[PDB]
């Protein structure tokens with residue numbers, strides 16, 4: 001399938017070159033997979049989700065996304081226009097309040113929730129979790145992400161936006177999950193993207209158009225925006241039968257566009273997420 005005039009990041013993930021605007025992907029489109037978006041919530045009523053999004057858990061007085069961040073990330077995973085995996089099922093877990101903040105104890109509970117809740121969902125092609133959040137190093141946060149991954153969920157986490165080594169941030173620093181840095185439309189490392197040995201992959205993260213609350217759209221930047229590109233890609237590849245939750249990060253790294261990004265510090269992988277779809 002070909003989506004013309006796609007957001008640059010979608011075009012980038014199906015291209016061997018920057019500077020194109022059509023997204024090419026297998027029509028299976030993540031059908032039969034599920035992606036949990038662990039964030040500020042999801043505005044499931046947005047027409048862009050086509051009834052494929054739902055809130056499954058909140059730790060606050062509402063499950064609604066009063067912020068927008070979670071809706072934007074969910075849109076990059078799976079919205080009809082802005083999403084990588086246009087037929088996946090999206091499950092929202094609201095661990096962050098409407099200001100975008102959340103206690104680590106709530107975030108940990110949300111991860112353990114997903115590890116169990118997937119057994120209440122129909123995801124025959126596999127389960128992914130997208131975590132566009134983080135803070136300072138915490139062994140407990142890292143352990144929760146490791147448990148979620150161990151339980152059979154492909155966990156993708158943001159590297160962070162500190163222009164620093166991700167070793168000092170969690171869950172970015174957990175080795176067993178997929179830690180995602182951000183790039184721009186010119187194949188440069190995003191100016192804010194963390195780096196370091198713990199990164200597994202880069203995805204589009206600067207000026208990413210997606211869904212927003214109030215039935216709207218907007219373009220924002222962050223490793224929060226790169227992470228759902230990788231989560232959606234994992235769901236797409238799992239539906240194709242090319243990889244599994246346990247191996248999807250390594251598969252994405254192995255099949256990535258290699259050596260094409262600029263301003264990647266020595267010791268950080270130079271790997272850009274790529275679907276290898278041959279139309």
Ligand SMILES: COC(=O)c1ccc(C[NH3+])cc1
Pocket residue numbers: 261262263264
């Ligand atoms: C240190 O000057 C740079 O910004 C830089 C230029 C090219 C590369 C190789 N991709 C890495 C870094």
